[PDB]
Ligand binder design. Structure first.
Ligand SMILES: [Cl-]
Length: 415
């Protein structure tokens, strides 16, 4: 009952951020903290003095020890670094240093850093490094799960998405006497535009093990809710650029609208670059998808596992309906986009599944198949194919039928 026994459990319930732990530490929120209205556990901190959260710890849990083990976890979503000003600029984001001793989380260009400091000028730093010179990044502007553990007799460890990345001995450190407060605030950042998103902060008064960490990752992933590429909840009525996970240098296009045209994967993507700062594939390419309410959605705008939907496709600034005639030859049913008034009795009902998958069905509820792609001669056409469904029934791996939904996001910054 690992979150339940945490010594600090910050969560947004009804109308307030609160510490749910038995300690009920005090929270002070600055004027310029922003909470996402879709999910107010998602907290945005700007490079402003009033964009801060302070936690006043109960005296019982202030860290002051040579020997006590402790850990912290949280999720973070860090916008792409765009500017030379971001190089060589380590900035604190979670501060628990007082009198030059304690702990802190800081960031730098392509880095997440944990620092410990004793009362005898000793220091230890574990670091996660990620590149901005990468076609498609797992990390830039995407939610990722951080976990840091500390065993005073041996090592400090940093985990990303449940996996151990770095470790260093901390037996070079004597007494660590951390602050009575924890300050969530960008401290020392030279770039006025910088911000972070954070969520689900916890402290623990032991060293978490690998298993506990993986289980926290899985539990906090919200697996009944589909996610977009950035890790935010997938929504209805929101345009998405599509990325097929088996061929990430292509985007979705449509040769011609109507039943005699088809959807296909076209490449290459272009690139976006700032010399010495980033070099990535362009994400805002192709014919956008919009998820439309059909049988689900009666409570909010969020797309959930097993929701039945329609998919609209934007072609030259007009919406069309993804559909197919399942009567066509062969298992692989080539997808088209149809004028919405003219879709008739074509197969168009999509069952969303949480990576994201889409199972096409006819109007009687029979499966046409998962949406993927199939090579016909020299073209990768989008299809619905029951071959995928039958491989899943046999517990066999399937390639080509998993998708990313990429909305425009300011933390990506592409035009
Ligand atoms: Cl795949």
């Amino acid at each position: 009952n690992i979150i339940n026994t945490s010594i600090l459990n910050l969560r947004y319930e009804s109308n307030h951020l609160i510490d749910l732990s038995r300690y009920a530490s005090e929270i002070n929120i600055g004027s310029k903290v922003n909470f996402d209205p879709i999910d107010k556990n998602q907290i945005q901190l700007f490079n402003l003095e009033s964009s801060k959260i302070e936690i006043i710890l109960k005296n019982a849990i202030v860290y002051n020890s040579m020997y006590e083990n402790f850990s912290t976890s949280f999720w973070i979503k860090i916008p792409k670094y765009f500017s030379k000003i971001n190089l060589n600029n380590e900035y604190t984001i979670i501060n628990c240093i007082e009198n030059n001793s304690g702990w802190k989380v800081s960031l730098n260009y392509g880095e997440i850093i944990w620092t410990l400091q004793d009362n005898k000028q000793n220091i230890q730093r574990v670091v996660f490094k990620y590149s901005q010179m990468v076609a498609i990044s797992d990390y830039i502007n995407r939610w990722i799960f951080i976990t840091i553990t500390n065993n005073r007799l041996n090592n400090s460890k940093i985990y990303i998405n449940g996996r151990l990345i770095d470790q260093k001995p901390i037996s070079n450190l004597g007494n660590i006497h951390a602050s009575n407060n924890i300050m969530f605030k960008l401290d020392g950042c030279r770039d006025p535009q910088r911000y972070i998103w954070i969520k689900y902060f916890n402290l623990f008064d032991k060293e978490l093990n690998e298993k506990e960490i993986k289980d926290l990752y899985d539990n906090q992933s919200n697996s009944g809710i589909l996610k977009d590429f950035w890790g935010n909840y997938l929504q209805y009525d929101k345009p998405y650029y599509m990325l097929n996970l088996y061929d990430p240098n292509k985007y979705v296009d449509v040769n011609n609208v109507g039943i005699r045209g088809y959807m296909y994967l076209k490449g290459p993507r272009g690139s976006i670059v700032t010399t010495n700062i980033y070099l990535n594939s362009s994400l805002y390419m192709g014919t956008k998808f919009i998820i439309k309410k059909y049988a689900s959605g009666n409570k909010d705008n969020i797309v959930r596992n097993n929701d039945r939907v329609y998919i609209n496709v934007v072609v030259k600034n007009k919406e069309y309906r993804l559909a197919t005639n399942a009567s066509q030859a062969g298992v692989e049913k080539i997808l088209s986009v149809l004028e919405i008034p003219d879709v008739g009795n074509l197969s168009q009902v999509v069952v969303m599944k949480s990576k994201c998958k889409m199972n096409l069905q006819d109007n009687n509820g029979n499966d046409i198949g998962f949406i993927g792609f199939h090579q016909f001669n020299n073209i990768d056409k989008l299809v619905a194919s029951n071959w995928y469904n039958r491989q899943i029934e046999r517990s066999s791996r399937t390639f080509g039928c998993s998708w990313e939904f990429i909305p425009v996001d300011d933390g990506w910054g592409e035009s």
